[PDB]
Amino acid sequence: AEYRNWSKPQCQITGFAPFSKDNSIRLSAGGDIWVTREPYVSCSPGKCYQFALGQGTTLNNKHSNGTIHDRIPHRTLLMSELGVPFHLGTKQVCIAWSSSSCHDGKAWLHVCVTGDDRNATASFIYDGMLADSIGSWSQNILRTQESECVCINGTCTVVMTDGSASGRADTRILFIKEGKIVHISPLSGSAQHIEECSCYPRYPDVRCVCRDNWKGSNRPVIDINMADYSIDSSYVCSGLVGDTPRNDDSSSSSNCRDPNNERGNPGVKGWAFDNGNDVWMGRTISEDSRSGYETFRVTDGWTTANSKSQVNRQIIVDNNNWSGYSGIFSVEGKSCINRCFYVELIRGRPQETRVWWTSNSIVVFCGTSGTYGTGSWPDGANINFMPI
Amino acid sequence: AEYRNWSKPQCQITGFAPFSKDNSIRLSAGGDIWVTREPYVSCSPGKCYQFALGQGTTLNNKHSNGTIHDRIPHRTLLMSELGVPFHLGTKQVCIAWSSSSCHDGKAWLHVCVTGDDRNATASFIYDGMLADSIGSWSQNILRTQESECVCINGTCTVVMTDGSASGRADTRILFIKEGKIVHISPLSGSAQHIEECSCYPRYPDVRCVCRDNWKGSNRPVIDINMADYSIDSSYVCSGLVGDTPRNDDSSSSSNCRDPNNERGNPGVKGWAFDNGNDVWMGRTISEDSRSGYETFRVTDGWTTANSKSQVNRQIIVDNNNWSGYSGIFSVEGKSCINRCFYVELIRGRPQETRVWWTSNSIVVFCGTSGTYGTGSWPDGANINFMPI
Amino acid sequence: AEYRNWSKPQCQITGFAPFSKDNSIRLSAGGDIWVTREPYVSCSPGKCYQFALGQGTTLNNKHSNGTIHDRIPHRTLLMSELGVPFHLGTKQVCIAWSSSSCHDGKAWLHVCVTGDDRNATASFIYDGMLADSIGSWSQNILRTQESECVCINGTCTVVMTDGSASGRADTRILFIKEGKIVHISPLSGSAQHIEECSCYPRYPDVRCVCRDNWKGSNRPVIDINMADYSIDSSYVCSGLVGDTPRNDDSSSSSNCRDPNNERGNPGVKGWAFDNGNDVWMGRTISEDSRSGYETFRVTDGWTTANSKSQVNRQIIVDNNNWSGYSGIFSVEGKSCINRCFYVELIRGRPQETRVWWTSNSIVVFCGTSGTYGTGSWPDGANINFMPI
Amino acid sequence: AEYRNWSKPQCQITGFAPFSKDNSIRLSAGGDIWVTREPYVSCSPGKCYQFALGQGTTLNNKHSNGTIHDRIPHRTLLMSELGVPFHLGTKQVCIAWSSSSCHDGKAWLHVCVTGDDRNATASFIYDGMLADSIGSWSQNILRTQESECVCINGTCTVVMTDGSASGRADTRILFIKEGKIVHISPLSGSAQHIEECSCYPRYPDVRCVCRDNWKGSNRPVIDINMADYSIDSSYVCSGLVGDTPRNDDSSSSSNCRDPNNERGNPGVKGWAFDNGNDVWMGRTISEDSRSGYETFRVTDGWTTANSKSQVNRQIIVDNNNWSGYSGIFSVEGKSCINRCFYVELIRGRPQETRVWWTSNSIVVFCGTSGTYGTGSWPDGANINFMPI
Ligand SMILES: *[C@@H]1O[C@H](CO)[C@@H](O[C@@H]2O[C@H](CO)[C@@H](O[C@@H]3O[C@H](CO[C@@H]4O[C@H](CO)[C@@H](O)[C@H](O[C@H]5O[C@H](CO)[C@@H](O)[C@H](O)[C@@H]5O)[C@@H]4O)[C@@H](O)[C@H](O[C@H]4O[C@H](CO)[C@@H](O)[C@H](O)[C@@H]4O[C@H]4O[C@H](CO)[C@@H](O)[C@H](O)[C@@H]4O)[C@@H]3O)[C@H](O)[C@H]2NC(C)=O)[C@H](O)[C@H]1NC(C)=O
Ligand SMILES: *[C@@H]1O[C@H](CO)[C@@H](O[C@@H]2O[C@H](CO)[C@@H](O[C@@H]3O[C@H](CO[C@@H]4O[C@H](CO)[C@@H](O)[C@H](O[C@H]5O[C@H](CO)[C@@H](O)[C@H](O)[C@@H]5O)[C@@H]4O)[C@@H](O)[C@H](O[C@H]4O[C@H](CO)[C@@H](O)[C@H](O)[C@@H]4O[C@H]4O[C@H](CO)[C@@H](O)[C@H](O)[C@@H]4O)[C@@H]3O)[C@H](O)[C@H]2NC(C)=O)[C@H](O)[C@H]1NC(C)=O
Ligand SMILES: *[C@@H]1O[C@H](CO)[C@@H](O[C@@H]2O[C@H](CO)[C@@H](O[C@@H]3O[C@H](CO[C@@H]4O[C@H](CO)[C@@H](O)[C@H](O[C@H]5O[C@H](CO)[C@@H](O)[C@H](O)[C@@H]5O)[C@@H]4O)[C@@H](O)[C@H](O[C@H]4O[C@H](CO)[C@@H](O)[C@H](O)[C@@H]4O[C@H]4O[C@H](CO)[C@@H](O)[C@H](O)[C@@H]4O)[C@@H]3O)[C@H](O)[C@H]2NC(C)=O)[C@H](O)[C@H]1NC(C)=O
Ligand SMILES: *[C@@H]1O[C@H](CO)[C@@H](O[C@@H]2O[C@H](CO)[C@@H](O[C@@H]3O[C@H](CO[C@H]4O[C@H](CO)[C@@H](O)[C@H](O[C@H]5O[C@H](CO)[C@@H](O)[C@H](O)[C@@H]5O)[C@@H]4O)[C@@H](O)[C@H](O[C@H]4O[C@H](CO)[C@@H](O)[C@H](O)[C@@H]4O[C@H]4O[C@H](CO)[C@@H](O)[C@H](O)[C@@H]4O)[C@@H]3O)[C@H](O)[C@H]2NC(C)=O)[C@H](O)[C@H]1NC(C)=O
Ligand SMILES: *[C@@H]1O[C@H](CO)[C@@H](O[C@@H]2O[C@H](CO)[C@@H](O)[C@H](O)[C@H]2NC(C)=O)[C@H](O)[C@H]1NC(C)=O
Ligand SMILES: *[C@@H]1O[C@H](CO)[C@@H](O[C@@H]2O[C@H](CO)[C@@H](O)[C@H](O)[C@H]2NC(C)=O)[C@H](O)[C@H]1NC(C)=O
Ligand SMILES: *[C@@H]1O[C@H](CO)[C@@H](O[C@@H]2O[C@H](CO)[C@@H](O)[C@H](O)[C@H]2NC(C)=O)[C@H](O)[C@H]1NC(C)=O
Ligand SMILES: *[C@@H]1O[C@H](CO)[C@@H](O[C@@H]2O[C@H](CO)[C@@H](O)[C@H](O)[C@H]2NC(C)=O)[C@H](O)[C@H]1NC(C)=O
Ligand SMILES: *[C@@H]1O[C@H](CO)[C@@H](O[C@H]2O[C@H](CO)[C@@H](O)[C@H](O)[C@H]2NC(C)=O)[C@H](O)[C@H]1NC(C)=O
Ligand SMILES: *[C@@H]1O[C@H](CO)[C@@H](O)[C@H](O)[C@H]1NC(C)=O
Ligand SMILES: [Ca+2]
Ligand SMILES: [Ca+2]
Ligand SMILES: [Ca+2]
Ligand SMILES: [Ca+2]
């Protein structure tokens, strides 16, 4: 086995087609299934896996009470083949309340953060072995992507932020080789309060679309040069913005350079990617809350400030149903690199108070250059049928 | 690994021998097992798998209520090694309320249809990656075989129908290479309403025996030329007809060319195959309902209109037990190609109203050129022992 | 991969050491575990598996009621790695109420008998594919070994009896090559009623020690010539006899040639093997019932009629606990072939009537040339803690 | 594959980073999970596994009652990939109420002791086969390490003790090659009572740190010459001692040569390792009971009697939570050999009497040469939420 390079152009797509759905919450009502959140998807060259942060309990279990809290010592990174639900035989790959994973063509790298909020440890696990670690550098909360990292030619890159709810954010970009940290670069350019990057290979570089936690409903973009470790950043140009909350479509804006100061907090993890002058992106259908999900393309939305010219809309989850985080992953075909995405479907607290638990399922779609129809693919659990 | 060609003569069989049984419903009464329907079986060169359309729930689970409905967004295609029941570690391979799968010698192809009734999407997944998609061409329930597709020399063929189950039904035959659609041919010949084809290789071509949903209790036959993509069709010659409902054996008929207009609707998925002038075929034992199952050969039943000369009858499931859909799969031996079949054993609604769910198990038989005995292998669950 | 030949001498042993235990019944009281009987063990060159005939149900399940009956259509052959209990992910390899399995160095062969009592079918499954079948030749009850068959240089041999409670037994030895029956030899020599052979390779031939159902508490022996397909048979010489029931040790006998006419019915499946003039053997501790288990060597017990000279006795299961069938399997080391055995530990009906089910666990021991101590390794479940 | 030699220097570590946690007890309250104790970890060159001694039952199962008792015939050695909890599909690798395991670069060796207290058997299983066995030499509870053995160049070593727990016991060091015992050496040097050694490679030799059961709260050290089979022993020099119970830090001592006679009984399994003149070690935080866990380095604590100079402390489990046994394992990187450890987190009896069972989970950490933060990673189960 050789290192992956992702050295192919991006597939020209017309939209997205259904790929996978796990039905975790529906299954939790008649079986032993992990309580989770912050899922994502990543593929080795041989196959695709779903990941998530467990809460150290199954759902029909009294320890599921209070699982809205993000950071406890019992959280571990779960890894299962895509489509296989998170049952009791699922592997806990490392201890983590924040994570990122990727495969370099030879082995899996996992970045796993756990410990005290303000003095955390990030472990780097390469090929099933502990290879390196780093402590929190600012003693705010050290956190990472909650989606796949990206490796080119044996060098993997991951974005991390040591930040706090007060809008403090010290963002650094790590370069890692067989689990060893070989360089760390500070964030540079105009992006301001970066969390939870969704990154993708754009050979010879890497590009991330992130979450502005504090001041922008427009999404930050980071460019990472894999050859000399230099960094740049800005915001997605599209006047149809990707975060939640946000203004409505006729009053929303972006100038490509600065956070837009429109309903900037708290934001939600999401994704977007460039196709020439155009941008493909997802977002929640609601402007206020994490409900529904839609994808579309914005013509000129990548290079012209404030374009609002959409086309190729699809509903993924209708607006009567809960969504959550979303993110990108990439797949190498014979001649081109395809872009896919997942949507976290959160059930329970805080929106549904009949139960005491918090958990999610997922749905996944992939780029197609064929044709397709319409639908809606929500979580599908009836909250009244669940353990409490 | 090379592509499969199926370029051997058909095994001369004397009947069928027991091969596999999954006991799903019996197991569902003391364990977490998936609710399913529309199962089938397909073998790679290395092993066999069972497939089915899940209902996004286990059986001992309140979400099993109402699983008589065919099309919900939570249906996924389940895949498990043959004989491993559909438990909670089962892989959901794609989102689907109608499907077909086959292995081309290198990798698995799955065809997965989901979404709105009037605007569905069919996804094509090859080697674990999304390779193509199509949208509905008549806007009235795009649907496919619910059994294995067939590949020769890297080209896979699958039959799909869209449109009104009564009138203006539009059947198309797709040709697919590594998951990309390379050609689509319209149905041609005298077959009139086609659904749920059971197909098999007949080198260098492919042949399918289908279900006439509307006017015929005699089964349609479709021939598919894999060299030039041309199509022909007619009806199985045998005066002993294969659909349900049907007339009794002394008043049933077929003229090879047209639907017989004898109790044509609604039909059931089934199979048949040719051996020279003879046909081997399965059907339900009851002429009225989906109860029992029997196989036999009809001498001259392939090439002479209205032959009623049977031999080699076997009871697979006795007429005191429910059956369901059935279909064919093929297996390559060292010197010949064998034919096998599966029977869906449907339990619950509509026939059994003590419970609120609908599900199935399977039983599977394969051609033999040896000797064999008799028996009956029904589902075996006691409806009174079940969750409700 | 090449075919196995088992062309190594037998390891010289001093006794047996503990190898595996599955604890099935103890686990069944707090988990979903298959109901089974007639287990055995067999190893491919890479690993060992435990096998058993399921009853189409888990134990904590209302379908476990009435599982004392030996022959229903829902019985399937279960296969799991040795030490992994028979849980819901266990593979049902074929449909069977009697079976035998073995690995030829390239693939698994399973012999699986199911159907009507008096008109059964035996299927032969090689490398996951149905390769042949045979019907009952006498229309009594067709049955096979309930332990491993043996393959040498690509030819596998298995012993089958088509027999009935009226002392009738038509015994045949089959020779099978990649799942095809290539020859069938009748039983020959002085053994009279043969059931449930425990067989082992003894290069270039195969040797079996069986159960006499009717006239002998001394065990029949069969020799199988793998070059010309000829057969011979006789009875184990040892005056300490291996069947149950049997006379006590001072009044028991064998003349090497004939059944001893001492408490000959019904017997139990068991094993023995030769080491020069000596025999190693197991048997129940009780002379009346299937309780306890012990092993020992009888000096001159293989070649001198009526030798009662035991040495190296070990208790495996003490005489306050239920045993059951036992059998032999063989393991290829780098320089020699070791002999190992399993004991079925039957719980429930008919001996324990608080419950309505019958099932078993197993314990497994292997030949050692070292030293060892003492113990007792029974099933260990408390019948009062079980589902009913 | 070649034999492992561990012929690299020890990684220069700055402390330990989080690696794995299994959450067994928390899962256990809503799922079928094995009752265990005496866990450990060991890695093949390809992956890591967790091991433990099962109690022949799951926790939500009436057979869990009374599982404080250490030695029953139903105890088996459980083996699972690190992070996969001990669920019903877990492999039981051998029968054992005491064990040790290790990989020599080609295959797994397991040492498994079971049977009567006064006449036990130790089985040696190599590459899934029984290879050798030994009987008890002092007739008073033959027992071994409860952590990984160590192999260099194909020869594996394991330390065993038989005889009175707190009298004179008879400790022997076994040398094993492909499962065959090739030499046994008696303990030699000044160590007096030895139990439950934690051993590691220190090329070309092996070094163990053990438990003095009777007279010392300072830990015995054994040196094992792998080429010559010669043995030496003494006590860890550090005045900060590693056993439990022990005196407080200002009145504790060690003279490197003798047990310190300070609260010597009963002790607990633990570990330490040398780095030049320094020692790295773990211990319980409490001096009286098995509560909490901490690691640190003692400067000059390996070569100067009574050093109390600690640095680089880390809390692993805080002192409001139960700990248990701990031990070491080693991992081969590209340029150096890393040291890792596990901690057993015991729940239930005798400390927690609301329930009738005893079981544990684990947490695992590995050496790092990077930086890290702080935390506490206890078991996390609420005793009030558990089956009784
Ligand atoms: C079966 O399923 C298919 C596949 O899912 C469905 O087809 C979808 O339908 C989507 C919804 O209609 C559609 O996406 C929309 O696209 C329009 C842009 O539409 C175009 O306008 C441009 C601009 O010059 C033009 O390029 C287009 O091309 C024509 O020809 C081309 C080929 O050359 C082809 O693309 C076209 O089909 C067409 O023949 C076409 O004219 C966009 O405006 C839509 O966005 C508005 O509407 C949605 C609601 O659907 C809102 O949520 C948005 O906010 C937005 O509305 C705002 O903006 C409006 C101003 O534009 C304003 O009027 C509103 O008030 C509001 O402020 C949306 O992006 C897909 O492109 C199409 N996909 C494909 C592949 O065709 C099909 O409908 C299904 N059929 C059935 C029966 O269900
Ligand atoms: C143990 O297991 C085995 C294997 O399963 C069982 O063997 C089965 O048994 C099946 C039922 O009998 C049988 O299938 C039937 O086949 C007959 C055709 O049989 C032949 O008839 C022809 C000529 O017309 C004849 O020449 C044949 O030759 C004999 O001798 C030669 C020697 O050279 C040899 O080649 C042959 O093997 C045979 O020994 C032979 O007799 C067929 O007629 C049956 O069809 C009617 O019956 C079934 C009920 O069984 C009805 O449901 C059907 O609807 C059908 O009924 C129509 O037929 C009549 C004529 O019109 C009419 O009365 C009715 O009203 C109706 O209209 C059926 O298909 C298998 O062939 C046989 N398999 C084999 C391999 O032998 C065995 O029975 C089991 N034993 C026990 C003890 O349980
Ligand atoms: C710890 O564990 C070990 C191993 O598990 C225990 O030592 C076991 O003990 C077994 C039980 O005693 C024993 O098996 C017995 O063997 C005797 C035969 O004993 C031998 O006699 C021959 C013949 O002259 C002689 O060669 C032997 O000398 C030595 O050399 C051999 C080398 O080949 C070696 O095995 C030893 O080193 C050995 O000392 C030796 O003297 C046999 O007579 C026993 O069978 C009778 O007793 C049992 C009860 O155990 C009955 O159930 C039988 O039916 C049988 O009784 C019949 O015959 C009697 C004599 O005529 C008569 O009185 C009765 O009424 C009846 O008709 C039995 O098979 C093992 O060989 C020995 N194993 C080993 C490996 O050494 C040790 O006991 C354990 N310790 C503790 C404290 O638990
Ligand atoms: C985020 O996480 C990190 C990593 O976990 C935490 O950092 C660790 O913090 C611990 C706890 O403090 C440190 O361990 C302690 O080490 C003490 C010795 O180090 C200091 O003293 C020596 C000289 O004797 C100095 O040389 C040191 O070095 C300084 O400079 C060097 C550069 O050369 C750097 O290494 C350092 O960064 C410093 O800048 C240190 O200043 C050691 O004394 C201590 O042991 C006592 O304390 C504990 C409680 O912590 C007791 O339980 C224990 O019994 C010992 O107590 C006895 O000791 C004395 C007298 O004998 C008395 O004080 C007591 O009463 C008692 O009798 C412990 O081992 C650890 O080294 C450090 N790790 C690293 C890599 O730095 C961060 O704190 C955490 N941050 C936050 C914000 O949470
Ligand atoms: C989850 O835990 C909460 C808080 O511990 C439980 O609610 C409490 O119930 C007790 C009585 O058992 C009251 O005295 C408290 O005042 C309640 N607190 C709150 C915040 O409501 C709750 O019942 C637990 N949920 C479940 C399903 O057991
Ligand atoms: C399954 O669901 C059905 C309907 O979705 C339930 O039946 C209804 O129960 C309601 C509420 O009690 C009644 O008012 C209605 O008359 C019922 N509807 C129908 C169509 O009968 C049914 O009880 C559910 N079954 C189970 C076992 O939960
Ligand atoms: C297992 O099945 C048996 C036999 O069917 C059940 O016992 C019978 O129940 C009938 C009808 O309900 C009673 O009238 C008889 O007293 C029983 N008949 C016989 C022949 O014993 C038994 O109840 C079942 N066991 C469980 C646990 O459900
Ligand atoms: C676990 O088993 C123990 C041992 O029998 C039970 O504790 C005893 O309970 C019996 C009656 O059930 C009492 O008479 C004894 O006094 C108890 N013994 C001791 C030492 O306290 C206990 O009931 C069982 N626990 C559970 C949950 O079943
Ligand atoms: C199977 O597929 C291959 C690839 O298409 C075929 O390859 C050959 O056949 C072509 C058509 O006859 C030739 O003109 C090509 O040059 C040639 N290509 C290669 C790579 O050999 C092959 O014939 C097919 N085999 C069968 C039995 O249909
Ligand atoms: C990547 O890596 C090596 C050197 O580190 C180089 O030789 C190789 O040719 C490179 N390949 C690609 C695709 O970048
Ligand atoms: Ca924002
Ligand atoms: Ca019809
Ligand atoms: Ca007998
Ligand atoms: Ca001590």
CA distance B147 to B128: 19
Is residue D387 within 8 angstroms of chain A, CB to CB? no
CA distance A248 to A267: 15
Structure tokens at C381: 């479940």
Q: How far is CA B263 from CA B31, B161, B222, in A?
A: 41, 22, 21
CA distance B210 to B194: 6
Q: Which amino acid is at D53?
A: L
| Residue count of chain A | 388
Q: Of all protein residues, whose CA lies closest to atom 75 belonging to ligand 2? A: B312
Contact C94 B18 (CB under 8 A): yes
Q: Which amino acid is at D18?
A: P
Q: What are phi and psi of D224, to 5 degrees?
A: -125, 115
> Which of C27, C373, C385 is facing D136, going by the closest CB pair?
C373
Largest CA distance in chain B: 55
CA distance A211 to B43: 46
Q: Resolution of the experimental model in angstroms, please?
A: 2.5
Is residue D84 within 8 angstroms of chain A, CB to CB? yes
**Which ligand has an atom closest to residue A61 CA?**
5
| Catalytically annotated residues of C | 70, 325
| Topology, domain C1-388 | Neuraminidase (2.120.10)
Strands B180-186 and B169-177: antiparallel
Q: Of all protein residues, whose CA lies closest to atom 22 belonging to ligand 3? A: C311
Shortest distance, CA C299 to any CA of chain B (angstroms): 46
Contact C23 D74 (CB under 8 A): yes
CA dihedral A31, A34, A37, A40 (to 10 degrees): -90
Residue B248: CB atoms within 10 A of its CB come to 7
D313 is in an annotated binding site: no
> Which of C56, C89, C135 is facing B380, going by the closest CB pair?
C56
CA distance D371 to C380: 50
Tell me the sheet residues that pair with B160.
B172
SS3 for D133?
A: strand
CA distance A53 to A143: 13
Residue B364: CB atoms within 10 A of its CB come to 27
Say if ligand 10 is within 6 A of residue A20 CB.
Answer: no
Q: What are phi and psi of A64, to 5 degrees?
A: -70, -15
Q: Of all protein residues, whose CA lies closest to atom 11 belonging to ligand 9? A: B227
Residues 6+ apart with CB under 8 A from B317: B285, B292, B293, B323, B343, B345, B363, B376, B377, B378
Structure tokens at D7: 């012929």
Name the residue ranges covered by the structural domains of chain B.
Answer: 1-388
CA distance B75 to B92: 9
CA distance D45 to D2: 11
Say if ligand 9 is within 6 A of residue B153 CB.
Answer: yes
3-state class percentages of chain C: helix first, strand second, coil last, to nearest 5: 5, 50, 50
Residue in chain C nearest B33 by alpha carbon: C88
Against chain A, the chains showing at least 3 CB pairs within 8 Å are: B, D
Q: Which residue has the tokens 């996004």?
A: B56
Is residue C377 within 8 angstroms of chain D, CB to CB? yes
Contacts of C112 in chain B (CB under 8 A): 18
- Nearest CA to C336 out of D131, B318, B291, A123 is that of D131
Residue in chain D nearest A86 by alpha carbon: D84
Strands D169-177 and A155-164: unpaired
Sign of CA dihedral A129, A131, A135, A141: negative
Q: Is the peptide bond before C204 cis (omega within 30 degrees of 0)?
A: yes
CA distance C72 to B26: 13
> Which of B30, B377, B385 is facing C58, going by the closest CB pair?
B30
End-to-end CA distance of chain C: 48
Contact A375 B129 (CB under 8 A): no
Helix H or strand E encompassing A234:
strand A231-235
- Nearest CA to A151 out of A89, A198, A201 is that of A201
Q: Of all protein residues, whose CA lies closest to atom 41 belonging to ligand 2? A: B311
Contact B375 C58 (CB under 8 A): no
Q: Which amino acid is at A98?
A: S
Shortest distance, CA A25 to any CA of chain D (angstroms): 15
Q: What is the CA radius of gyration of chain C?
A: 19
CA distance D218 to D224: 20
SS3 for D64?
A: helix
Is residue C29 within 8 angstroms of chain D, CB to CB? yes
Q: Which residue has the tokens 């078991």?
A: D379
Sheet strands side by side (includes B195-202): B195-202, B205-211, B220-224, B231-235
Is residue A92 within 8 angstroms of chain D, CB to CB? yes
CA distance B171 to C73: 40
Structure tokens at A46: 């041989």
Contact B95 A366 (CB under 8 A): no
CA distance B97 to B79: 14
Say if ligand 4 is within 6 A of residue D374 CB.
Answer: yes
Number of H helices and number of E strands within chain D?
0, 24
> Which of D62, D76, D119 is facing C23, going by the closest CB pair?
D76
| Residue from D36, D58, D59, D63 to probe the interface with C (highest C Cβ count within 10 Å) | D63
**Which ligand has an atom closest to residue C212 CA?**
13
A211 is in an annotated binding site: yes
Contact A27 B94 (CB under 8 A): no
Against chain C, the chains showing at least 3 CB pairs within 8 Å are: B, D
Residue C165: CB atoms within 10 A of its CB come to 11
CA distance D162 to D170: 5
Contacts of C81 in chain D (CB under 8 A): 91
CA dihedral C299, C300, C305, C311 (to 10 degrees): 0
B344 is in an annotated binding site: no
Helix H or strand E encompassing C317:
strand C310-322
User: Is the Cβ–Cβ distance between A310 and A298 less than 8 Å?
Assistant: yes
3-state secondary structure chain B: CCCCCCCCCECCCCEEEEEEECCHHHHHCCCCEEEEEEEEEEECCCCEEEEEEEEEEECCCHHHCCCCCCCCCCCEEEEEECCCCCECCCEEEEECCEEEEEECCCCEEEEEEEEECCEEEEEEEECCEEEEEEECCCCCCCECCCCCCEEECCEEEEEEEEECCCCCEEEEEEEEECCEEEEEEECCCCCCCCEEEEEEEECCEEEEEEECCCCCCCCEEEEECCCCCCEEEEECCCCCCCCCCCCCCCCCCCCCCCCCCCCCCCCCCCCEEEECCEEEEEECCCCCCCEEEEEEEECCCCCCCCCCCEEEEEEEEEEEEECCCEEEEEEECCCCEEEEEEEEEEEECCCCCCCCCEEEEEEEEEEECCCCCCCCCCCCCCHHHCCC
Shortest distance, CA D139 to any CA of chain C (angstroms): 9
- Nearest CA to C61 out of B33, B22, A85 is that of B33
CA distance A350 to A388: 14
Structure tokens at C55: 């009853």
Say if ligand 2 is within 6 A of residue B353 CB.
Answer: no
- Bin C348: left if φ > 0, else alpha if -120 < ψ < 50, else beta: left
Structure tokens at D223: 């040196």
3-state secondary structure A149-177: CEEECCEEEEEEEEEECCCEEEEEEEEEE
> Which of C56, C114, C116 is facing B26, going by the closest CB pair?
C56
CA dihedral A180, A181, A183, A188 (to 10 degrees): 140
| Catalytically annotated residues of A | 70, 325
Say if ligand 4 is within 6 A of residue D368 CB.
Answer: no
Say if ligand 9 is within 6 A of residue B203 CB.
Answer: no
Say if ligand 6 is within 6 A of residue B229 CB.
Answer: no
Range list of H helices, chain C: 24-28
DSSP D112: E
User: Is the Cβ–Cβ distance between B56 and A26 less than 8 Å?
Assistant: yes
Contacts of C33 in chain D (CB under 8 A): 88
Say if ligand 6 is within 6 A of residue B61 CB.
Answer: no
